[PDB]
Amino acid sequence: EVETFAFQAEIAQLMSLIINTFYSNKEIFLRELISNSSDALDKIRYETLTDPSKLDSGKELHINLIPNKQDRTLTIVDTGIGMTKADLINNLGTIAKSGTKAFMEALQAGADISMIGQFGVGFYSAYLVAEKVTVITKHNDDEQYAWESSAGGSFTVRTDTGEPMGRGTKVILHLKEDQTEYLEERRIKEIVKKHSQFIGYPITLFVE
Ligand SMILES: CS(=O)(=O)c1ccc(CN2CCN(c3cn[nH]c3-c3cc(Cl)c(O)cc3O)CC2)cc1
Numbered sequence: 001e002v003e004t005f006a007f008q009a010e011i012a013q014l015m016s017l018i019i020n021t022f023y024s025n026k027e028i029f030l031r032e033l034i035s036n037s038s039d040a041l042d043k044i045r046y047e048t049l050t051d052p053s054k055l056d057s058g059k060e061l062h063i064n065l066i067p068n069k070q071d072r073t074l075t076i077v078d079t080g081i082g083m084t085k086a087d088l089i090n091n092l093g094t095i096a097k098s099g100t101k102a103f104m105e106a107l108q109a110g111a112d113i114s115m116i117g118q119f120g121v122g123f124y125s126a127y128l129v130a131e132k133v134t135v136i137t138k139h140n141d142d143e144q145y146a147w148e149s150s151a152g153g154s155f156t157v158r159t160d161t162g163e164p165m166g167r168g169t170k171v172i173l174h175l176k177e178d179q180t181e182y183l184e185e186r187r188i189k190e191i192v193k194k195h196s197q198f199i200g201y202p203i204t205l206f207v208e
Pocket residue numbers: 033035036037038039040041078080081082083092093094117120121122123168169171
């Protein structure tokens with residue numbers, strides 16, 4: 001079964017500011033998770049320049065956007081390097097304490113939540129729109145895991161035995177009842193187009 005972990009003080013701290021703040025431009029969250037995957041594929045590509053059998057676990061590199069109007073999920077899947085268990089636990093490979101500090105000195109002092117990726121913690125903008133995030137990751141040398149949180153200042157990590165994926169990371173947004181517009185064809189295209197045009201990797205928008 002299913003170990004539970006506390007979010008460090010500062011990361012729990014952040015999250016509640018995200019959940020709680022009145023802030024209207026919630027759409028940046030997709031910019032942020034895109035930029036993250038974009039960062040992970042970069043890492044496996046560099047990694048393959050020296051050892052070309054790292055790409056043994058699926059050799060094409062892309063971001064898929066999969067809306068599901070039925071389960072209220074939107075899922076942003078990539079074939080990037082992936083996280084090991086160790087990573088997942090470390091705020092999903094982010095600097096977080098370090099990062100959040102900078103963020104809030106920049107926050108309380110004239111600058112909005114949209115600059116959150118400039119501090120290395122874009123992931124959490126997920127909670128602008130999601131009431132529960134599930135994160136699926138496989139990385140070559142480890143096995144596959146599921147990280148999950150609905151905030152509340154904790155998170156699960158199970159080793160997951162649903163889908164094999166060879167490599168990369170699946171971020172499932174189980175979206176808030178009133179944010180169903182992010183399952184919309186029109187809206188996701190608008191957003192992926194105005195905020196992630198020059199992401200150097202093919203972004204496929206799935207249709208339903
Ligand atoms: C492109 S960036 O704006 O320069 C940037 C760079 C690095 C990060 C930090 N993070 C480190 C570990 N990362 C990683 C490694 N394996 N898998 C991931 C990964 C993580 C998340 Cl949270 C995600 O949504 C997708 C991923 O592929 C990438 C993102 C965030 C933004």
